[PDB]
Every structure is written in C-alpha cells, then in structure tokens.
Scaffold this motif. Structure first.
Motif, PDB file in Angstrom:
ATOM      1  N   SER A 182      39.512  12.287 -25.095  1.00  0.00           N
ATOM      2  CA  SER A 182      39.021  12.314 -26.385  1.00  0.00           C
ATOM      3  C   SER A 182      38.937  10.716 -26.872  1.00  0.00           C
ATOM      4  O   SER A 182      40.163  10.020 -26.399  1.00  0.00           O
ATOM      5  N   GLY A 183      38.180  10.358 -27.740  1.00  0.00           N
ATOM      6  CA  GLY A 183      38.224   9.132 -28.204  1.00  0.00           C
ATOM      7  C   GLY A 183      36.905   8.677 -28.961  1.00  0.00           C
ATOM      8  O   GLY A 183      35.894   9.531 -28.645  1.00  0.00           O
ATOM      9  N   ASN A 184      36.714   7.532 -29.724  1.00  0.00           N
ATOM     10  CA  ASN A 184      35.546   7.330 -30.342  1.00  0.00           C
ATOM     11  C   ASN A 184      35.602   5.802 -30.329  1.00  0.00           C
ATOM     12  O   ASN A 184      36.214   5.099 -31.026  1.00  0.00           O
ATOM     13  N   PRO A 185      34.609   5.348 -29.682  1.00  0.00           N
ATOM     14  CA  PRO A 185      33.443   5.758 -28.639  1.00  0.00           C
ATOM     15  C   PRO A 185      34.033   6.745 -27.536  1.00  0.00           C
ATOM     16  O   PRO A 185      35.296   6.693 -27.306  1.00  0.00           O
ATOM     17  N   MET A 186      33.195   7.597 -27.077  1.00  0.00           N
ATOM     18  CA  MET A 186      33.581   8.477 -26.164  1.00  0.00           C
ATOM     19  C   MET A 186      34.086   7.821 -24.914  1.00  0.00           C
ATOM     20  O   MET A 186      33.435   6.777 -24.296  1.00  0.00           O
ATOM     21  N   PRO A 187      35.064   8.077 -24.250  1.00  0.00           N
ATOM     22  CA  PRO A 187      35.653   7.317 -23.105  1.00  0.00           C
ATOM     23  C   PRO A 187      34.979   7.608 -21.804  1.00  0.00           C
ATOM     24  O   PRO A 187      34.685   8.859 -21.920  1.00  0.00           O
TER      25      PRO A 187
END
Ligand SMILES: *[C@@H]1O[C@H](CO)[C@@H](O[C@@H]2O[C@H](CO)[C@@H](O[C@@H]3O[C@H](CO)[C@@H](O)[C@H](O[C@H]4O[C@H](CO)[C@@H](O)[C@H](O)[C@@H]4O)[C@@H]3O)[C@H](O)[C@H]2NC(C)=O)[C@H](O)[C@H]1NC(C)=O
Ligand SMILES: *[C@@H]1O[C@H](CO)[C@@H](O[C@@H]2O[C@H](CO)[C@@H](O[C@@H]3O[C@H](CO)[C@@H](O)[C@H](O[C@H]4O[C@H](CO)[C@@H](O)[C@H](O)[C@@H]4O)[C@@H]3O)[C@H](O)[C@H]2NC(C)=O)[C@H](O)[C@H]1NC(C)=O
Ligand SMILES: *[C@@H]1O[C@H](CO)[C@@H](O[C@@H]2O[C@H](CO)[C@@H](O[C@@H]3O[C@H](CO)[C@@H](O)[C@H](O[C@H]4O[C@H](CO)[C@@H](O)[C@H](O)[C@@H]4O)[C@@H]3O)[C@H](O)[C@H]2NC(C)=O)[C@H](O)[C@H]1NC(C)=O
Ligand SMILES: *[C@@H]1O[C@H](CO)[C@@H](O[C@@H]2O[C@H](CO)[C@@H](O[C@@H]3O[C@H](CO[C@H]4O[C@H](CO)[C@@H](O)[C@H](O)[C@@H]4O)[C@@H](O)[C@H](O)[C@@H]3O)[C@H](O)[C@H]2NC(C)=O)[C@H](O)[C@H]1NC(C)=O
Lengths: 393, 390
Positions: free
Chosen positions: B30-35
């Motif tokens: 998960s993460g933002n931006p998408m990893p």
C-alpha cells in the motif's frame, strides 16, 4: 620413641581402578615403609575397616585385599561395587591411600550389531558397531569384516577410501552404488576376558541417488557431541552430515566463555578426513568446544562438540617434611596435575581438615598438630594424594 | 495523504512445492502514490524471466510453473527471493522468501530392531531418509497382528504414538517380541502415504541378575526444538533391572538449582517420557531426568527451545523531524529465538545490530523509508517506518 621415626610412606599404592571378571577374581596390594614399620589396614568408603567375607573378600596379611572368583549368584554390591582405600599408620601418624575403585563384572553373553547406513551418492559414510550398553564399558571395536572376506584395522586408510576411526567407526568416502554390493560386520573384543566376536548381523550401505538439490542435514542426535579421551591417545571428532552436491567441512574452536571462534589448524598431529577430524595424540590443550560447519551450494549446517582431555591425577606436597618450633606457623603447599580437577581437600592422620585451598596453613603450632598431613585431589573418575610429615622442636 | 510504501501482503518465509505442482507467490503493498512491486535476489538485483521455470507477471506474482526433473535449475528452484515495494518517497524490502522446488521421487523408511530388557519401556523409531526428512512425517504404526496406532490416546495403556512419530511401548514382555512393527509416513507435497519396507522387532533381554540404569552416550544430552502451541515429548532413554523410576526437574535459569516438573492436564508422564499437550513460552529451559533403581542411578538433561513466529513493529510508524534534531526508531519484536536485529534505509543496510536506530542530526538525505529486520536461522520478519523532514 624420639626421632629416627619416620611417618608412613606408600611403597606401593593400590591402583585407582581394578575391573575384573567374576571368573578371574582380583587382588589389590598395599605396601608402606616407615619407622617403625606401619600397619596396613583396608577401609571401606565410609572409613570403617573392611571385614572378611568368605569366598568373596579375604584380607591377606601380605597387604593384599583378595577378591576370589565367584559365581553370578554370589555377587554382592557391598563387596564387588565398592571404593576401598589403604590406611597406613605408625606411632608418628597415619595416611590414607587414593580411592580404589573395585568393580567385579559378571560375565554375560552379548551380540554386537550393525544396521543399514543410508547415504547420498558422493557423501562419506560412517558405519557404527552397535555394542550393547551393559558391556560397552569393556567391549571395543578391533576391526571390520566384509562378506567379500576383506578386513580393515586401525592405522592407515585403505586405497584412500576405507578408514577405521579411533572411535571404532568405519569411515568410507565417496560412496557409490557399487559400495552397496557388500555387507559390513565388526569384530569386537572384550578387554577383561580377551575373547573376540563378530557381530550377529551385517550392515550394508543404502545409496540414494537424489535429483535436484538437498541441503546439509544432520540428525538431531548428532548435532551435539560430547567426547572424552585421555592423554597420548588417538581420537576422532565426527561431523556426520548428508547433502547433494557433496558438502565441504570446516572446523573451528570457540574461545572459552565466548561465542567467538578460531579456525582449527591442520598439521602432522591434527589431520582431516572429509568431515572427520583425526588427532594422533591428545594433549590437555585440545580440550574445549568445537564447531564443525558443513557446506554445500544450497545451504549450511553445524555440529557442536565438547572435547574433554582427561589426564591422570598426581600430587605432591611442599615440603615433604618440616620441623617448626612451637608458636611458629606451619605451611603445606599442595601441587597437583592431571585433568579435570573438581575438588581439593586435606587430611591429618586420617581426619578431614581445612577446606579446598591448595595451601594449608597452621597459624600456631601445638604438640597435637604433629603427625601426617595429606592433600587429596579428585574428579569424577579417579583421585590422587600426597603426604607430608610435621615434627616439633 | 501522501505516504511511503507499506507491505499489505508479504510472502511466507518458507514456500515448498513439487515440480509437478509449481508455485505462485504473491506480494502486495500500500502507499500513495501506488508503489511498484519488484522481485529481487539477495544482492539486490532484480530477478529475470527464465523461460518455463520463473516468470514474472503483471499482477506482481512470481510464478514457478510445473517442470521436468531434467529442467531443475538450482539458481531458480532453490533460491532466496525478496519483494521490494517502491515509490518516490522510498523503498522497502520484504522478509526472505526461501523458495524450494522439490523433485518428487521414490523414498522408503526403515525400522530397525530394538533391544530392550524385560519389564522396561521401548521406543521404536521410523528411520526416514535425510533427503526427504523435511517433507515426510509418521502418520501411523502397523503390526502383523492387525493393529494400527495413530497419534492420539494410549492403546490398552501400553502403546502410544509420540508427537515425534515414534512408537512408545511401556513394560515390554516376550509377548511384545512376537509382533512386527511398520510405520506409515506421508509426504506433505505429494500427499502419498507409504509403509516401511522393513519391519521392526523387539528383542527382549532376560535379566542376568540386577543391572544399574545405563544410558547411551548419545542419549545423555538432548536438544529439542518445538513450535509454540504444538504438542511434543521429552525422552529419558534408560535401561535397568529391576525397572527404574523416573523423576523430571527443571533448572532455574542459569543455576544448579532445580525443581520437580508439575504434572497436570497439560503435562503428563508416561513411564520415563514426558508428554506435553501444547507448548508454552515458559517451557523453554534446561530439564533434568533422574533415573533410579536398587543398583544405582543415572541422569539425562535436556535443553528445550520453544520456537515462536517472528514479528516486528517500528515505533513510531511515521515521524517528521526538523534539521539538526534527532530521529529515533525503535524495533519491538516477538518470537523465539531472536538471533539478530538489523536495519535498512531504502533497501540499503544501515547502522548495526540494535533494537534502536538513532539519527543524531537529521539532514535532507536522511528522509525516506526505514526498516528493521529480525531473524534467526529458521525465519525472518520485517517492519517499516517513514521519516519526513520539517
Ligand atoms: C557454510 O554455511 C554456514 C551456515 O551454517 C555459513 O555460516 C553462517 O554465516 C552466516 C553469515 O555470515 C552467519 O549469520 C551471521 O551471524 C553473525 C553472527 O551472529 C550475525 O552478526 C550476522 O548478521 C547479519 O545479518 C543481517 C541481516 O539479518 C545483516 O544485515 C548483517 O549485516 C549481518 O550480515 C549473520 O546473522 C551464521 O551464523 C553462520 N553460521 C554458523 C553456524 O556460524 C558459512 O558462511 C557457509 N560457508 C560456506 C563456505 O559455504
Ligand atoms: C516432476 O519430476 C518427477 C520426477 O522425475 C517426474 O516424474 C517421473 O518422471 C519419469 C519420466 O522420466 C516417469 O517415468 C519413468 O520413466 C521410465 C522410462 O523412461 C519408466 O520405466 C519408469 O518406471 C520405473 O519405475 C518403477 C517404480 O516406480 C520401476 O519399478 C520400473 O522398473 C521403472 O524403472 C518411470 O515411470 C516417472 O514414473 C516419474 N516418477 C514419479 C515419482 O513421478 C514428473 O513427471 C515431473 N513433473 C512434471 C514434468 O510435471
Ligand atoms: C538417583 O540417581 C541419581 C543419579 O545418579 C542420584 O543423584 C546423584 O547422586 C550422586 C551421589 O550418589 C551424586 O554424585 C556425587 O556428587 C557429589 C557432589 O554433589 C560429588 O562430589 C561426588 O563425587 C564423588 O564420587 C566420585 C565417584 O562417582 C569420586 O570419584 C569422587 O572422588 C567423589 O568421591 C559424586 O559425584 C550426583 O551428583 C547426583 N546426581 C544428580 C543428578 O542428582 C541420586 O542420589 C539417586 N537417588 C537415590 C535415592 O539413590
Ligand atoms: C562367572 O559368572 C558367569 C555367568 O554366570 C559364569 O559363566 C556361566 O556359567 C554357567 C554354568 O554355571 C554356564 O551355564 C551353561 O549352561 C548350559 C546349559 O546348562 C545345562 O546343563 C545342566 C547340567 O549339565 C542341565 O541339566 C541343564 O538342563 C542345562 O541343559 C551348558 O550347556 C553350558 O555348557 C554352560 O554350562 C553359562 O553359560 C556361563 N556363562 C558365561 C560363560 O557367560 C561363570 O562360571 C562364573 N565364574 C565362576 C568362577 O563361577
């Protein structure tokens, strides 16, 4: 009395241990000089004088304590599994000998055995002669025999493949299918009676031919080794592991009390055969914790070994004799060797005194303090003592 | 809210499979931006496609298709892989993924003779070959008198399969030396069960007078490992006539003092063997088994290690620190044993072995993703945290 009198000294001290068959019997001897000539008295472990047992234990006034041959039904633990000692005394003082571990062994029929040894192609094999526990203390591996009428003895490697290890196992390197075409049986010898015997069953190599790759695996019963061997004896440290491709073996030695280790040095005395470390002569310096790291291209594994190099216990007191004036201090320094040493203790005319210090000290001498002073050193297996006389004036 | 990568689904430490089955390991972050997900080797280099053996798919799955025995490649089929998630803020690496493809082939277990003195207890062992020991376990035992013992309860108060897979037999007599013994073993990758080729037999010895308890040198010291909450047993292999008694004790940690083991609902004693229903963390320690009869005595000591899954968490999950001020990461973990606790920043080794990582004076460069790795010889686990600038 006056002087010229000398405290007792053991001309011949009984052995630390005498194992004997019920069919042989045994005799332990005690001789002590001194002026006047001392009296020899055999005593039990609890300090009391040993009594004659008709047919089982007889005091011979030559100093000998005799244990005649006897039938199995007449075995007495009180007599035959006992620690004895020789007490020597004269008017000047008295000394007690080192422990005499007397062990009579009722002869018994037994059969050694050899099971199938499973090994991966290319790996080294180790075939064990399975000796029953109730004779393991007396039965040793002399040699190995094959159904092809081949025989291997301790010494050197045969064709650079077969080697009888000092510990009695038959080591075989680079095992292939063809090696499983013969069966192995060990020739054992009882050290008391002296007879030899072939194992009731034969053992063959069961060679596996793995596809893919398998990591070094050691049996849980082989991950931790605990070996004992005495001075000047040849011995071997096993590192039994199986893998494909064939693994390599590196030995190390831990620094005492730390996790740090150091690579084992190979030389004339310490040679390596596959994963087996072979030492021609044991020195007390060898004692410690060892690590055998086994390796192949897929993974690794290790074997820990605690090596103990036992050494005969000996002792002498400095000075052997001393004359000190009343009021002046008396000093006794116990020097000892051997390995291990677990307990130091002192005695005076057969009576326990002092504590566990190597130097016994009498602050102010009285006339009662004169006599024989002894120093005992001990481990689990044996013992040793030294005497010293204290006079006044 | 823009945040660095965090592992959503992490592949297991161990992934075994047959060459006929293949395998499909998955990684999701998960993460933002998408990893982006990237499979790598130990040296950090990305793993490449090997035609028909190792193929990367868009879903982020690393696939190992079924293959022929001749097509086994060690670099592919016995390798430690790792998943790397990454975005602009930084990258994080997953725990070690030990992939092992196993070529299915014939094996066979064996059972040797057991020599036992009349009246004593015997333990029959199902000897499994080394090259399959990691995948083959005892399922049951079998006699030529049509008896099938399974792991569970005691049979007629005489026969009992131990959690180790060994058949325990109490108070053996010549009657027990008439029957034969075979073990059934299952391979957990093929699901196949197999009878041992050989049949174990009990050779009962008649006592030639009294005998003191003897223990074989390899039985004097035991070193047992057991997973938490799982069942296990502790042997005390001693032979004597008349039959001896057995008393267990547990040493107070790092002392010569010992106290009797409390037998109860969880811990039972069958003759000399100590049967435990389920392992707890407190069971770890050094034990002592004392053996006695009229002739003499003997002792066995056991070092028990209750292994438990490794887990890690960094405190705090995120922190913003100004230039000149220190940043501190605390690795808090569970499981047993913990051999090492190392750190990483953006997929690069940093600091040394320590549960606390300290940045004395934060700079622009110090921003990114930080990880700590806890692991022992058997498994590994990771946790991640982010450092922002103020
Ligand atoms: C043969 O195989 C053996 C395996 O039995 C192998 O020895 C092993 O080497 C590894 C790596 O050198 C050892 O593991 C290390 O142990 C030290 C001391 O405890 C640790 O400090 C190390 O920490 C590392 O791991 C961190 C990640 O978790 C890293 O970030 C960090 O920088 C360290 O690199 C590491 O855990 C292992 O203990 C030994 N095994 C034994 C039994 O000693 C040997 O190298 C192989 N040799 C050959 C020729 O194949
Ligand atoms: C995953 O790998 C396995 C392992 O190789 C593979 O299964 C094996 O494949 C071979 C093909 O080479 C199968 O066929 C063998 O071929 C010979 C002829 O070439 C046959 O004669 C063999 O029969 C023997 O086996 C009998 C006992 O089982 C013997 O008694 C007899 O004398 C013969 O020598 C054999 O059939 C082989 O059967 C399989 N083995 C197993 C255990 O599966 C499998 O195909 C691979 N998976 C894939 C490709 O998806
Ligand atoms: C049931 O069996 C156990 C296991 O053997 C037994 O416990 C053991 O008792 C013996 C004594 O009978 C202990 O051995 C002694 O321990 C002291 C220290 O406490 C040592 O100093 C002793 O050394 C002497 O013995 C040596 C010969 O073995 C001599 O060479 C030496 O010079 C000393 O004279 C001796 O080793 C042993 O430590 C315990 N072990 C344990 C684990 O408890 C127990 O007594 C038996 N129970 C009954 C009721 O009989
Ligand atoms: C030390 O202890 C050892 C162990 O006990 C003794 O050795 C044992 O000695 C006995 C004899 O006392 C041997 O017994 C054997 O018995 C068989 C069968 O006995 C038959 O003979 C009678 C009469 O002949 C017959 O009526 C019975 O029905 C039996 O048929 C004999 O065939 C054998 O020859 C032998 O005598 C044990 O075999 C033997 N065990 C060993 C050597 O391991 C030893 O004698 C003791 N030492 C001393 C000095 O007493």
């Amino acid at each position: 009395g006056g002087a010229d009198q000398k405290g007792p000294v053991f001309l011949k001290e009984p052995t630390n241990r005498i194992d004997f068959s019920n069919s042989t019997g045994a005799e332990i001897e005690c001789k002590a000089s001194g002026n006047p000539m001392p009296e020899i008295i055999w005593i039990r472990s609890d300090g009391t004088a040993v009594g004659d047992v008709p047919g089982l234990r007889q005091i011979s006034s030559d100093g000998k304590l005799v244990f005649p041959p006897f039938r199995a039904e007449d075995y007495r633990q009180e007599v035959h599994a006992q620690v004895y000692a020789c007490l020597a005394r004269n008017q000047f003082g008295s000394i007690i000998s080192r422990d005499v571990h007397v062990r009579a062994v009722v002869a018994q029929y037994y059969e050694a055995d050899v099971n199938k040894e499973h090994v991966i192609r290319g790996n080294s094999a180790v075939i064990k002669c399975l000796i029953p526990s109730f004779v393991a203390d007396f039965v040793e591996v002399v040699s190995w025999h094959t159904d092809e009428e081949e025989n291997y003895f301790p010494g050197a490697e045969y064709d650079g493949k077969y080697l009888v290890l000092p510990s009695g196992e038959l080591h075989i390197r680079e095992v292939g299918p063809e090696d499983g075409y013969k069966s192995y049986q060990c020739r054992t010898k009882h050290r008391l009676t002296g007879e030899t015997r072939l194992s009731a069953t034969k053992g063959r190599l069961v060679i596996t031919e793995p596809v893919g790759s398998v990591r070094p695996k050691v049996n849980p019963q082989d991950k931790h080794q605990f070996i004992d061997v005495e001075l000047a004896s040849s011995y071997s440290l096993l590192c039994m592991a199986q893998s494909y491709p064939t693994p390599s073996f590196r030995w190390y030695k831990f620094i005492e009390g730390t996790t740090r280790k150091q690579a084992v040095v190979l030389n004339d005395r310490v040679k390596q055969v596959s994963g087996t470390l072979i030492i021609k002569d044991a020195v007390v310096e060898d004692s410690g914790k060892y690590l055998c790291v086994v390796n192949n291209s897929v993974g690794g594994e290790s074997v820990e070994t605690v090596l103990t190099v036992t050494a005969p216990l000996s002792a002498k007191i400095d000075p052997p004799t001393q004359t000190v004036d009343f009021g002046r201090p008396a000093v006794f320094t116990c020097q000892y060797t051997g390995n291990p040493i677990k307990t130091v203790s002192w005695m005076k005319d057969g009576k326990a005194i002092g504590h566990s210090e190597p130097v016994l000290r009498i602050e102010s001498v009285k006339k009662e303090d004169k006599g024989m002073y002894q120093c005992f050193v001990r481990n689990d297996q044996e013992s040793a003592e030294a005497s010293a006389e204290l006079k006044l004036g």
